[PDB]
């Protein structure tokens, strides 16, 4: 019902292949690929504040679902898009050639980003506090 | 006794002045100054693994107290130094012209980095898992 939480990265698939595909340098990818950090979400109805930690980067994004937003991506580009909420537990958006699905089941968020033939999946678990 | 834990940044003083003094690019200072993320410490006796969230960066360092180590700093530069345990509750290191003190007070960690006339102070709080 609510995405709010601190989420500890448990596992991921295709981090290196996805980061290479969007153009990050290999020296940066290798430094970040084994980090398992904590991302935070604060949901207030349609409003979301994301403090995303991915590899060596922290990205702070804020959006209201249904409204055009500007999202900072892993390349540093800020992309104009709209994030939608499907049901109460799936956030969906597209930007550039990437399809992103953020799904909350119980305490586990599965984030699936698809770029051509690369499916970049992150499994994170809410810290019980 | 143990530093082990995940800690959320609560407040900080003189981030911009300190980051300017070490020459962090202005764009990273502005992007990172308001981010309050999660840092992790794993302590095994004298050995420490740090996953530090500072501004828009995540930095991983490992060291053994009393042994010469090579640490990555906020600019990405690597420094050769030694980290000491002071009075059993403070980790202390000096590198270049910076003195860093990491002090554990129950669930509160305070990190104080002194660079000339600038005292960069971070106060964080243990996440109760
Ligand atoms: C356009 C949105 C932000 C783009 C940043 C891409 C880096 C990976 C995004 C995954 C974060 C999704 C939130 C769940 C928590 C997590 O997996 O850290
Ligand atoms: C030895 C290099 C330090 C890393 C450079 C970034 C400066 C911030 C370091 C503070 C981290 C200390 C651990 C406590 C938690 C925290 O304050 O994030």
Swiss-Prot record, chains A, B:
Supply the Gene3D superfamilies for this chain: 2.40.128.20
Modification type N6-succinyllysine: residues: 31, 36, 46, 57, 78, 90, 121
- Modified residues annotated as Phosphothreonine in this record: 51
Give the UniProt subcellular location, in the record's own words: Cytoplasm
Q: Does the keyword Transport apply?
A: yes
PANTHER family (UniProt xref):
FATTY ACID BINDING PROTEIN (PTHR11955)
Q: What is the annotated role of this protein in its UniProt record?
A: Plays a role in lipoprotein-mediated cholesterol uptake in hepatocytes. Binds cholesterol. Binds free fatty acids and their coenzyme A derivatives, bilirubin, and some other small molecules in the cytoplasm. May be involved in intracellular lipid transport.
Q: What is this protein called?
A: Fatty acid-binding protein, liver
Q: Which gene underlies this protein?
A: FABP1
């Amino acid at each position: 019902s609510s995405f709010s939480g601190k989420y500890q990265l448990q596992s991921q698939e295709n981090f290196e292949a996805f980061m290479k595909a969007i153009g990050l340098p290999e020296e940066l990818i290798q430094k970040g690929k084994d980090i398992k950090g904590v991302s935070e979400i604060v949901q207030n109805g349609k409003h979301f504040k994301f403090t995303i930690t991915a590899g060596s980067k922290v990205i702070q994004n804020e959006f209201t679902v249904g409204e055009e937003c500007e999202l900072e991506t892993m390349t540093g580009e800020k992309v104009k898009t709209v994030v939608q909420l499907e049901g109460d537990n799936k956030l969906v958006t597209t930007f550039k050639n990437i399809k992103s699905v953020t799904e909350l089941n119980g305490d586990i968020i599965t984030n699936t980003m698809t770029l051509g033939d690369i499916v970049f999946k992150r499994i994170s678990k809410r810290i019980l506090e």
